[PDB]
Amino acid sequence: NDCIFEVKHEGKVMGYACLVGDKVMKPAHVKGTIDNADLAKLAFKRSSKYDLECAQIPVHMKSDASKFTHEKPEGYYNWHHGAVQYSGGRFTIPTGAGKPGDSGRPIFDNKGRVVAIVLGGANEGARTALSVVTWNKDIVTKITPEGAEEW
Amino acid sequence: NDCIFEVKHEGKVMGYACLVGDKVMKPAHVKGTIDNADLAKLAFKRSSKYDLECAQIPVHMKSDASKFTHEKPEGYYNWHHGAVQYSGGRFTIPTGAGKPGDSGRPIFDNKGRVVAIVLGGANEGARTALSVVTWNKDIVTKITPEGAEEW
Numbered sequence: 001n002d003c004i005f006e007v008k009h010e011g012k013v014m015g016y017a018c019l020v021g022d023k024v025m026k027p028a029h030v031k032g033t034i035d036n037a038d039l040a041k042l043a044f045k046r047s048s049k050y051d052l053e054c055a056q057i058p059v060h061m062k063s064d065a066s067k068f069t070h071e072k073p074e075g076y077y078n079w080h081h082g083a084v085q086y087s088g089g090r091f092t093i094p095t096g097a098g099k100p101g102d103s104g105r106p107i108f109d110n111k112g113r114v115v116a117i118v119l120g121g122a123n124e125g126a127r128t129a130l131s132v133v134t135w136n137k138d139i140v141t142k143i144t145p146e147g148a149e150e151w
Numbered sequence: 152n153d154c155i156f157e158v159k160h161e162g163k164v165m166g167y168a169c170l171v172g173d174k175v176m177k178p179a180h181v182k183g184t185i186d187n188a189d190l191a192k193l194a195f196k197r198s199s200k201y202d203l204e205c206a207q208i209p210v211h212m213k214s215d216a217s218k219f220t221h222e223k224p225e226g227y228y229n230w231h232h233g234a235v236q237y238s239g240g241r242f243t244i245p246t247g248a249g250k251p252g253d254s255g256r257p258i259f260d261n262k263g264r265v266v267a268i269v270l271g272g273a274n275e276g277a278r279t280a281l282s283v284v285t286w287n288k289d290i291v292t293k294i295t296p297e298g299a300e301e302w
Contacts, residue, residue: 037162 002112003066004080004105008035016104020066020114024055027104027119029150050133050142051119066106069113070135077115079107085127089143091116092127100151107132122148153263154217155231155256158185166302167255170216171265175206178254178270180301201284201293202270217257220264221286228266230258235281241296242267243278254302258283271301 007015009032017026017034024039028051033040042055057065077084077091081099084107085092091107098121106114116134122145131144158168160183168177168185175193177185179202185191193206208216228235232248235258242258249272257265267285273296282299284291 041161 001080002108003114006035007032007104009033013101015101018066018104018106018114018117019057019061019064020068020106022057022062022065024057025104025117026053027051027117028053030103050140052133052140052142066108067111067113068135069109069111069115070138071109072115072134073109077107077109078112079118080105084130090125090145091118091130091132092125093121093130095123095126095128098123098128098151103151118151119144120148120151122146152231154215154265156187158255159183164252166252169255169257169265169268170208170212171257171268172216172219173208173213175208176268177204178202178268179204180270181255201291203284203291217259218262218264220260220262220266221289223260223266223285226261228258228260230269231256236278240294241280242283243275243280244272246274246277246279249279249281249302251302269302271299273297273299 003018004016005018006013007017007026014032015027015030017024024042028046028048038058044053044055046053072086074087077086081097103119105118107116107118108114116132119131119133121128121130124147129145131148133140133142154169156168156170158165158177158181165183166178166181168175175190179197189209196205223237225238228237232253236243254269254271256269258267258269259265267283270282270284272279272281280296282295284293
């Protein structure tokens with residue numbers, strides 16, 4: 001629990017939304033609303049290409065945002081449930097650790113600076129390979145391995 | 152904290168409403184709806200002169216009501232944030248004891264009988280003199296010192 005915020009929709013916990021920099025980002029495919037009315041009233045823009053939902057952060061909450069970085073070194077990273085291996089341009093997780101519902105939770109570095117948002121994972125490598133959105137040459141881009149299932 | 156009840160509008164509390172005698176009392180300037188369904192459905196009457204919204208207490212809340220009294224001798228009184236001086240026909244409080252949100256707290260005497268409801272206040276330097284509606288010959292009357300701000 002550093003920046004993760006619960007999104008709840010019609011009885012079901014349906015993911016997490018994150019305010020980072022000037023954006024509130026949430027996966028477009030998870031329907032419903034973040035359970036604080038101040039956020040819930042903003043103009044959200046949908047992109048099907050990235051399955052991304054983006055919004056402008058309100059002013060009085062700007063200082064609550066997580067830091068970010070363009071730098072993604074190879075190594076181990078942290079998320080809510082433990083270590084995340086990054087190598088080969090792939091974020092990976094222990095096979096079977098995966099949990100449908102957690103899509104939208106951030107991945108962060110050794111200084112707690114978020115580098116990517118997880119969308120899901122693919123079960124036929126060696127470890128679970130994550131499909132994620134992240135910024136390369138300051139451009140947001142989605143990297144999705146073939147045969148990934150929605151979480 | 153014995154007989155004090157909220158009212159909330161778009162996630163933010165917007166002051167308080169109070170059941171007093173056989174009365175449901177709320178300032179009219181408090182925007183929004185009480186987030187408890189028994190209160191929101193009564194017949195409310197507006198008075199613009201007094202900024203008052205009025206309702207009859209339902210039977211199921213009758214045994215929760217605060218005692219009151221019409222007689223207000225000079226002295227000190229109580230509210231949630233401490234002492235309130237009444238003397239000279241003027242009620243005042245220490246500057247900083249009140250802030251946006253405290254409108255709706257009842258003011259009560261040493262026998263726990265509510266004598267007045269706060270609508271707002273005028274800072275006069277070291278202390279703040281409240282604008283309040285209260286009773287004279289059993290009739291509600293608004294007393295407002297010059298330069299009063301809503302709380």
